[PDB]
């Protein structure tokens, strides 16, 4: 069983430089939505991990992404400050600041995603039955499956007029997905050339 | 080998 | 309106040398293909180029993806050659071809993904509002949204028994969109590197 | 710019 009341408790539990300040202190708070989610402390350690090793960007995109709507061309981060736009274009970073702006929150901001929306696609991108080395992918597919049925319904008992929009909130998957490959790109540069400091967590995600 | 994660995941 | 079955009407109509020269000769099928999908001739020519040079290389993956269904570890090309996984590996490609293998054919072989539900993913791609400089961005989204709506009354009809697979399809995105990504920078590398020939289509969908 | 692509997108 996978109740969104459950996943909704879960999410209601140099600009560069503060930005990866930021993403280390969430990695934290990551570790303990997940640990919410329905069923997923109940997989094998070695697979909680994989799933978080594979999924952690893309899970903490999506979050400030959606707690940015109301942030005008910039985004808001887990410490409470703003980077706008220009600050990020100042910093080198303004192409994929902007893939986020565009792609990501302001079409949160359109359709109005609902926190339970933006729980359930969190989970969904968490139990990916993709992830190399899992012991039983099966096992996370069926999870996935039981998180999108939860969401299909809640989407079509919340918002019936709008038939489409369980497919709308998916289809935003594969720019997470790109954003999210561009994003680590960025940052596994940052690391090399060594001028940004890089937290332990953060940094321990960056290991091999 | 993810020290830091196994850590966090482990304890109740 | 976007009837299934004109979609599939548009459907029915060393190894990297042979993989490119390949790719090239599907290109020109390609272009046929997006004329046949309802409205996309009748959108701007610009916003035509600029869907298919966002979308090509996803597109012509997930179609050979499909025909690859019946061959045992590898895939088949529109030359009508197969390539095994051991020739992959052989040429230094071994891990990006892998990925197509497990995450896309075999998850296609798996729940039997047919024509019509290849063609609908298919469209849905092309018709990505998120294609940077489109005239109309919103022009797109709505025909993008008639595709799922037609898929999703499709799956329902035809797999009455399972209820999450139009979820299931809409969910093999990420992974095309990631394996995507990892191909066209393989195929940047080997123009590059100048040591494959590349064909006029194939190369000029490699320009700027 | 994109000769090949506009050539066959064009004629019908
Ligand atoms: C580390 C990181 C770096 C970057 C980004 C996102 C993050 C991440 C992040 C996570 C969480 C939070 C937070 O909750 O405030 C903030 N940032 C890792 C996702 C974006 C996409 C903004 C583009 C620019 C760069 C600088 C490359
Ligand atoms: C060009 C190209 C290169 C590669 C791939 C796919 C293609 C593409 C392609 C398209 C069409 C056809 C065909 O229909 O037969 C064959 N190949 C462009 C997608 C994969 C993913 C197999 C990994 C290895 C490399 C060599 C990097």
Request: glycine share 4%.
């Amino acid at each position: 069983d996978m109740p969104v009341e459950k996943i909704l408790e879960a999410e209601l539990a140099d600009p560069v430089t503060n930005i990866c300040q930021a993403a280390d202190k969430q990695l934290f708070t990551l570790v303990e939505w997940a640990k919410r989610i329905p069923h997923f402390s109940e997989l094998p350690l070695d697979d909680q991990v994989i799933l978080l090793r594979a999924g952690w960007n893309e899970l903490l995109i999506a979050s400030f992404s959606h707690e940015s709507i109301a942030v005008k061309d910039g985004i808001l981060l887990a410490t409470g400050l703003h980077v706008h736009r220009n600050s990020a274009h100042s910093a080198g970073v303004g192409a994929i600041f902007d893939r986020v702006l565009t792609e990501l929150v302001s079409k949160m901001r359109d359709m109005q995603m609902d926190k339970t929306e933006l729980g359930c696609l969190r989970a969904i991108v968490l139990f990916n039955p993709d992830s190399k080395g899992l012991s039983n992918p099966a096992e996370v597919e069926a999870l996935r499956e039981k998180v999108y049925a939860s969401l299909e319904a809640y989407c079509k008992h919340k918002y019936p007029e709008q038939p489409g929009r369980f497919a709308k909130l998916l289809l935003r998957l594969p720019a997470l997905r790109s954003i999210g490959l561009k994003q680590l790109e960025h940052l596994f540069f940052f690391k090399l050339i060594g001028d940004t400091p890089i937290d332990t967590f953060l940094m321990e995600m960056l290991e091999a | 080998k993810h020290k830091i994660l196994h850590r966090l995941l482990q304890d109740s």
